[PDB]
Amino acid sequence: STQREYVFIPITNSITIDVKITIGGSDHITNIDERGIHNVLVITGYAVDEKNGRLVPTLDPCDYVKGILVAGTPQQAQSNDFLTLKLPANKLYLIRKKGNISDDLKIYIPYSSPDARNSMKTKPVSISDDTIVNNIIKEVFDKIYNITQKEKVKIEKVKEDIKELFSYYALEQ
Amino acid sequence: STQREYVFIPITNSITIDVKITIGGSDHITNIDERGIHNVLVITGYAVDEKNGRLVPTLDPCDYVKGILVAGTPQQAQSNDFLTLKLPANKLYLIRKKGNISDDLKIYIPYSSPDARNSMKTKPVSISDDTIVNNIIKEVFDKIYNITQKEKVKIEKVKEDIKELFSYYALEQ
Amino acid sequence: KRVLIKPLEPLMFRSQGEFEPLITGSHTAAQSLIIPRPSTIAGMLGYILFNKSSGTGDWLSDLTNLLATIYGTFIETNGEYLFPLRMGNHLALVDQQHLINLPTLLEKEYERREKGIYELFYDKNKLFQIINHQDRIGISIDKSTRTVKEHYLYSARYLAFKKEVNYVIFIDNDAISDKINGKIVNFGGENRIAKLEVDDYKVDTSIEEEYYLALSPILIPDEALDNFLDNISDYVAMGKVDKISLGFDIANTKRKEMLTAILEGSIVKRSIIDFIKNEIKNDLRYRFSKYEKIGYNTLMSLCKLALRKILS
Amino acid sequence: EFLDYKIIALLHDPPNKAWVITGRARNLTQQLSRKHEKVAKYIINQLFGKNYSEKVDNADKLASSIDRYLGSIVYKERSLFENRSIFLKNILLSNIQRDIGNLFPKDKSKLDNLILEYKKLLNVINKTNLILKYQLFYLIYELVWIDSKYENTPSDTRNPTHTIFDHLYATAAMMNWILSLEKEAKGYLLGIDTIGVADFISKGRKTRDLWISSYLVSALLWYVITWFIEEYGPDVILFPSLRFNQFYAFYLLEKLRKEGVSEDVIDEIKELITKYIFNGDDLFENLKIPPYPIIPGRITLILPGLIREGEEYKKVQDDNCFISKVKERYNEGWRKLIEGLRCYSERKREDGFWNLVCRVLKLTEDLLQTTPLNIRVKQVSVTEDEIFNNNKLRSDSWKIYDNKYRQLVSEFKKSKLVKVTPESRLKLFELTKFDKLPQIGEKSKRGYEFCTSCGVLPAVVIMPKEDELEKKLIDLGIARDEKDVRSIKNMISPGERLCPWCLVKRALGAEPRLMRILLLGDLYSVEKIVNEIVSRDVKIEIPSTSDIASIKTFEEMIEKKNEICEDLKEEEVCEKPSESVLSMWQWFNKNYYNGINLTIDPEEYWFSEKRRRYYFSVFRRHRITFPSPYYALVRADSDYLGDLLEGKLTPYLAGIIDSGDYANISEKKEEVNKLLEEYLVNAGSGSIVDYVKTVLKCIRENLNKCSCAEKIYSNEVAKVMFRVNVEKANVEEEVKNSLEYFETILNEGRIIVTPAWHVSISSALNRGLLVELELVNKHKGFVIYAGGDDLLAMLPVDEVLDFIKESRRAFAGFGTEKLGNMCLENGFVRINNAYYPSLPIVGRSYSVIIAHYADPLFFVINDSYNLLEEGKEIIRYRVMYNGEYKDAKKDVAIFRYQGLTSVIPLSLKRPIVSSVSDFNEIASIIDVILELKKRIDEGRISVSLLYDYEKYKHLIVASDEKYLTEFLVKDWIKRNSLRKHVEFTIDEKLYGVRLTIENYPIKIPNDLISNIVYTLRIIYGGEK
Amino acid sequence: PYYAFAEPFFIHAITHLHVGSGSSVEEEIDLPFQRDELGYPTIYASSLKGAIKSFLLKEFPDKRDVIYKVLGEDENPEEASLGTFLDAILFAIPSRIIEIDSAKPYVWVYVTTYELLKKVKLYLDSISQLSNASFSNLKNKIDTILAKEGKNITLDSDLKSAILNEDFYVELEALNNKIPSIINAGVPLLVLEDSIGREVINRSLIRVRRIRIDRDKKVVETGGLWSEEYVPMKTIFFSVLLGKESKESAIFASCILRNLRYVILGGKETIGKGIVELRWVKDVI
C-alpha cells in the first residue's frame, strides 16, 4: 500500500534530516498548496526529548505534539527506535485538512522507550525565534519540498502560519 | 517511587489478575469509599487486543482504556511487554478526584508492541454484560479491596459503577 | 477558595424578562436557565457583603469593591463535576472525561462528526438525570369573588433537582471564607433559598491550549461585534451566541446592560483570546476588567480543571 | 455570453416518448416525414432547433441515474431491452405502479392541437424578451399538458421510476453545469439556510404576528432567489421546485401584468394557475398576495460559473461572488421593506397607529437596519477536471453531483454547531446603560422594559394599562388626539410593550399587501407598490387563538341565526357585514355571509369578563354549548427528509438504522442490502430485471470481483443481437460498469443522488403541500406556514385527530375523495389522468399542543419545537420488521395538554409501505381513537372507560396470548359501557407496543392502549 | 446575614388537603396534588405563603401593614419582602397497619421514607447556623435514623412485623433500642426503604372520582366524571419560615405567629379540604 513516516517539528538539533527517503512516487500527506500547511498530524499523550531527538509516550492528554506526514522510510541507521503501525487515516486526528486519504496507510513514529531514567515533566514550547523558523524549512521542509525557495512562493504567509499552527510539549531535561 | 501497576477491565478471558503481586505496602490510589470507586484513570490513544489481553497503543485520541491504580509490582514475570513510567500526579488524568497524590510515582501498564502487521480498526464496546458484571465483583477489585466485600460498603455499590464508569474501545482483531 | 451553593429547593433563574401580568387577555410564562449567570452569583455574595458607604450608582464599581474575583460555575453532584456543553440550541451537562476528545471530534469527517456529537447530547448528556423542569403554575386571587382574577395565571418552569447538586465557583479571596459560609442566601429567583459552603480547592489560574470551554458567558464588547460575527467560525467551534442582559441591579431597580455574549458551555478557539484583547479599547478595558471580576470571561481547559480568563 | 440553451434541454425529449419510443401510434412520426428525436425536433418550431452536441448528451447522462442503472449504451439504444408496456413506477417505492396505456397526442391532427396552445401563450412575449419565454414556458409546460388531459409517462419504459416531465426539468437544471463547463469551467451548488426559523416564528403575542413573521421568512428568501430567477431564469432552483410554487406563479403573473400583455392571455394563463398551482382558490387574486407563507427554509441552487454586469454573462470573477451577492441581496429586502413601510406609513400619516409607526420608523433607523432573520449561505464548486476527460464525460463522473451535494450538506451541519441568534448583531450596550433608548409611551420605572413579543430586545412602544387609556394616551406622545386611540388600541393592546422588530411585525400585520415589495422584487419601484395599496381599501382580518377556539360556537349560532338573533339585535352578533373584507382563512371567507359578523372579538363576548355570564345565559336559552377556551397547535414535520435527499435509507428503516449508522454502514450491512437489493430489482421492470437480478446475485459475500460477466454477459450478449446496430459496445466493460455502479450503491448503503432524484422529491414535496393545504381548510384550521415537509396550523381541538389521520395518509399518497383538482391514488397523486409520485415511505411526525387561547404564544411554539424535535428524537416503539420485532423511532404524533403527554405511532411497520396493501393501516391507531371517541359522546360508552383502564392494564400488559387480550379489552369496554349493543373492536395488532423513552422529562406510558387512553383524556381535557 | 432567624413548623392536615397543580402528572388523576422533584406531595412556597397571607389578613385586619412588610404588600408598592417560606416537604403520611399482635395493638401508623428524611435534614442543617435556639434535639434524631438507612425502621414501637395499607408486609427493626418520637401523638413512626415506602405512601394518597349529576333525571352528565387526589387527614408537612432582620418581623414572629394554630391551604374548601394545623417546632421540642 503506502509508506509514510512522522517527524516532529520542534526547535532543536538532530531533526535536520532523518527520513533518508523522499516521495519516490507522487504522494504526500502534509502539503503546502500556497494557502498554508494542510493535513497536519497531532499526537495526544506524547512528549518530545531534545536529548535523543524522538518522542516519549507519556500519559497526559495535555501533552500534544504537532508534526508533519510525508512519504518516506526510516533512516535505517536505527531501524528500531521508531514505532510503526497501520492506522487508517480517519483514525488519525489531523489539522486543517485539504482532502481525504487512502483510508489504509502504514505510519512510522519516532519513538523512545519511556525512559524511566527520570520523572517526566513536560512544558509547552514556542517556535517564534524567527532565525529558527528559517533553518527548519531548509532542514526538513526542503528535503520534501525543495520548491519553496524557488520560482514563486508567498513566504510571508507559509512560514508565518508555521509560527501560528505548530506547537508541542517538550521535556526540558 | 511506588510500583503502582494499572490493570485493565476489558471484555477478555485473561483478565483474572495476570499479576501475582498484591498491595505489597499499604497504599493505593483508587478507593471504594461509600460512594463507589475513586480515582479511576483513563488511558486515551490506546486500544485492547482481545487475544493477548493488553493495552495496544495507538495515536487516535478517541481510542481510550480505563482501569485502576494498584501498588502491586508488575507480576515480576514479564519485564518486557509492559510500559513503565516515571510520572508525577498532575500528569495522571484521573476520574472521581478525592485525594491528591505524592506527585512522583512509577506506573506499569499492560503494554503491546504496535504489531504493524495488519491495518487497525478499533471498535466501541461496553462492559455492562450483567452475566459477566458479577464476575468483576470478585474478579479484580475485591482481590485488592477485600475489606469492602465482607463487613463494609456494599459490593452492589461497585456494580452500577463498572457498567457506568469503565467502557473501553477494543480491537476486534 | 471554592464555594458550593446548595439549593434547598427548586430555583428559577429566568431570562427573557417581562414575567408579570401586563396584557389583559393573556397569561404570563417564564423558563429558567440551567446554570445561573455570573451576575446572579456575584449579586448574591454582593448582597451579603453589603455596606451602604460605597457605590451610589455603579452596581459593578460598587460590586467589584466587595468580592475579589469569581471563577465560572459548574455542577457537582457527589464529588463528580459536570460542565455545561452547548450546541445549536442544545444544552447538555456532560462529565469531565468527555471533553478531552472534542477538538478531534469537531474535525472528523462529516458522518463521523455527527454521530460523535449526537451521542454527546443524547446518550452521554447527564443533564436530565440531575435536573427536571418543574413547571409550576401560579395564580392571583381577588378576595372579592375568591376565584382567579382576569387571566392572572402564570407558568414558571422551575429547576427541580433529582439528586443533591451544588453550583461550584472559586474566589481569589481567602478572607472571604468565614464571612460567606454556612449562610442562608436568597439565591436569585422567585424568592428561593440556597445554602453557602466554603472549602479549599487547588486549581490552576492561567493556562494555554488551542480549545477552551466557556464556563461563563464571554462578553463581546459590541464594537468588535461586526468584525466578529462575519467570521464566527474562526472563534467559536461550537456553542451559541446571543444577546443577553446582564441582569437587574438591586440598589437602583434597573435592568442592567444588554450586550452580545458567547453562552456558557460553548467551545471557543484560542483565536478568541487575542482577538478580544486586540479589539477591546482601554476606554472599555477598565469596564470589561470588572465584568471579569464578577466572573464572566471564564475559560476552562478541555484537559483538566484549569481555569483561565481572557483579560486576566 | 448568451447561453440560453436550456430550452433545447427542456424539450429534448417530448412528453410522448414512451408512446413514440417502442411505438403505439407510430404515425405522428409518419405524418410529418433516430425516431423519438424527430417528434422531439418537430415540436421545436418556435426558435433555435436541437443541437446534437454538448447540449443534451452529457446533460441527459448526469441528469438521472437511468444511464447507470440500465447501462450507458442500452439507455441511448431503445433497442433489445424492450418492453411494450408503459408502467409508471414510484421513485421511492418500486412495488407501486400505475399503468399508462394511451392518452397522448397520437396524430398531428391532435399533436398540433396543443402546439397552438403553447404558442398562443408565448406569442404575447416580445421575442427579444426570451427570459419571459423561458420563465412562462417553465411553469406552464406540464400545466397545459395536464389541462389537455394526457396521462403522465415515465422517462424510460425500462426503468419507469422517473416521470418524463421531472427528468426533463432535471436535465435542464444540470444544463447550467454542462454549459458553464464547456466554456471556461466553473459550476457551483449554492445553498441557503435560515438560522432559527422556529425562534423567529415564536416571537409574537397574536397569530397575525405568527402569520406575518412566518411570511417574512418566505418573502425575505424569495426576494433573494428571484434575482437568480431574473439572471439565469428558472431551473437554477432545485429546492424548492419551482414547477408547483404558489409564490413563483404569483410572481410570474405580475411580470406579465408588468410591461404589458394581452388581457385574455394573462387571463388565459390565470385559469391554468388557479386550477393547478392553487386549487380553484383565486383568493390570492383578491388578497393580491399568495395567501399561504410556504417556507422553503432550505434552498439549494445549481448555478453556472457565469456572471452578468458585462451587459451579458462572462466568467465569474471570484468564488465568493455568489455568497456575498446573496448576503447583500438578503439585507436589501429588509431595507426595501423598511423603505416601503416608511413610505406607506407617511401616506397614511393620519388615521392613528401610523403616526405612531412613523414616529418609531424614524426614531429607530439604526436598529431597523439589521435584518431580524439572519440566513446562512454555503457553496461548493466543480471543475472541468472532475467531469471531463478531454471533451466527453469521464468514468465515475456520474457520482460527482452526489459527492458535491454531500459536501454541501456537511458544510451546513458543520456550521449548525454554532447558533447565533439575530439579536446578537444589534448594538444595545450604550442604549441600555445610558437612557438613550427611544421609549415612545410610558417611561420604564426600571430601565428599559423588554418587549412582550420577543422578550429579548428592549421595548420602544410601551403601553399603559387599563386604568384608562384616553387620558393616558393623549397626554403622552402616543396619541395626538382621542379619535386615534380606538385605532391604536385596534392594533396594540393596552399594556403591550413592543420592540422595533416586533412593531414592524405588527405594522405589516396591519397591512400584509406591503409584502409585495419582497414578493415581486426589482419589478416595480417601491413607490408604485405602495400606491396600489393606498389606492385600495383591502381589509385582511387574520384569526386569533380566541377565534379558533370559537369555531363550533360560531358554526352553531350560524345555523340557529334567526332564533339567536332577535334577543341581541344590537351586540354585533346579528350585525350585517358592512364591508367586503377577506382572509386567508378558508373558513372565515367560507361563511362570512350568514348575518353573523365573524369579525367580533370573542374577548368582548363569551370569552370576556364584563359579558361572560350574559352570553352564557344567551347560549343557555338556545341550547348552544358554551365554548371551550382551548385550540390545538398542530405542527407536522417529515422524518429524515433532508437525510433522504442524501440518498440514505434512514427514512425507510427509521430507528432500525439511524443517521449515526452511516458512519459505518457495514454494521447494518445485512439490512441496508436487503432493502437496496429490493429497490433495484423492483425498479426497472421488463426484460431488464432478470439481467440485474443476476448482477446483484454475484455480489453478496464479497463475490466475483468482475468475474460475473460470465453469468451476465450471456444475459447481455445474447440480447445485443436482437438488433444489428451495436457500434462499439464492449460487453466485457458494459457489464463491468454496471457492476461498478451497483457496487458503490451497496458499499455506500445509499442511493446515488442525481438531480432527477432531487427534482422529483422536490416537486412531489410541492404537490403534497397543495393537498396539505386543502386538509387544513377542510378541518376549519388556520395555516401558519406549510412549506414542503413542514407545517404549522391552528386547528380546533375537535378536528385535530381526524386531521392527523387524513394528513398522514395523504402524505403517503393514499387517501379518500379528492381535495382540490387532485386525487390520492395509493401513493400517487393524480391531477386529471396525470399520475405523480408522492412520498409513501417517508415518516411524518406530528406534535399537537392543546393550549388555552390565553397562553403565551412564545412558549406554546417553543414547546412544539422542544416537545417533538427533542422528544421525537428519543421515543422508541416496538415495530414489526420482517417478522422480527425491532425498535423504531420516528412517526409518532405526540400529544400534549399541560403536563399530560401521549404518543401514537402511525406506522407499526418499519418499511412503512412495501406494497399497495400497506396504505389502509397507516395511522390505523388514530381511527381506533376516533371510533372510541365517537362512541363516548353518543353515550354508548361512559367516559369512565378512560379511568378504569388502569386495573385492566397490568393484565393486558402481562398477557402475551392474543386470544386472551382480545377478551380483556372486550371486557374492559363492556363493563363501563352505557348500553348493551356496543361491539367496539381493537385491531389486535396493537397488543404490545411498549413505547419507551430514554431518561427524559417526558413520562409516556409504556404500552399502546394506555397511550390511546391518554390521547382521549388530552382531547377531552381541551373541551372543558 | 439578613436571615436573622428561622421558624420551622409542621403542617398537620386536620382534614384532607388538596393543593392543586393543574394537570401536571399522569397517573389517572385529572386534578392531582402538587408534587416535587421525586413524586411526593408537597405544598409550594407560593401556595403556602399566599394561603397564609390571604388568611391572617382577615384574622388580624389591624396589622395589615405588619403583614405586608413581612409577606409581600400585594399592592403595586414593591418594597422587598422580609419573610420567606420554603416548600412544605412531606414528612409522614398515615398508613393503615395490621401487626401480628407484635405490640400494644395499633390500627394506623405514620410512614416516612429515607428520601423524605434527607430533605428534612437538609432543611434542618441549613438553618442551624442562624437558629441560636438550636433544635439539635430534633436534628440529631434524623441523623441517627439516616445512619440506619437501608432497612425498615420503627422508632419507638416494638413491632418487628406488620402489614401496611393491606398490601405490603414489612419487617421492622428498632432504631438501636429506643428514642423519643417526634410527633407527640401516641403513634409509631416507620421509616421504610425508598422503594417499598413509595408504594405504601402512594397507597395512603386518596384518589377519588367525582360526579356531576343531571338534577332533573338524577343521572350523571356526559363527561361529568373526573378524578382528584387528596392528602389524608393527619398527614404532616414540614416547612420553614425564614425571616430577615427587621422590627416588623419581631412583631410578626411574636404577635402573629403565636396565634396561628389553624389555617386553610389549597382548594376545594367547600368540600372542607383545607383545614390544616401549624405546630411551630419551637415548643414541641
Ligand SMILES: [Zn+2]
Ligand atoms: Zn420584540
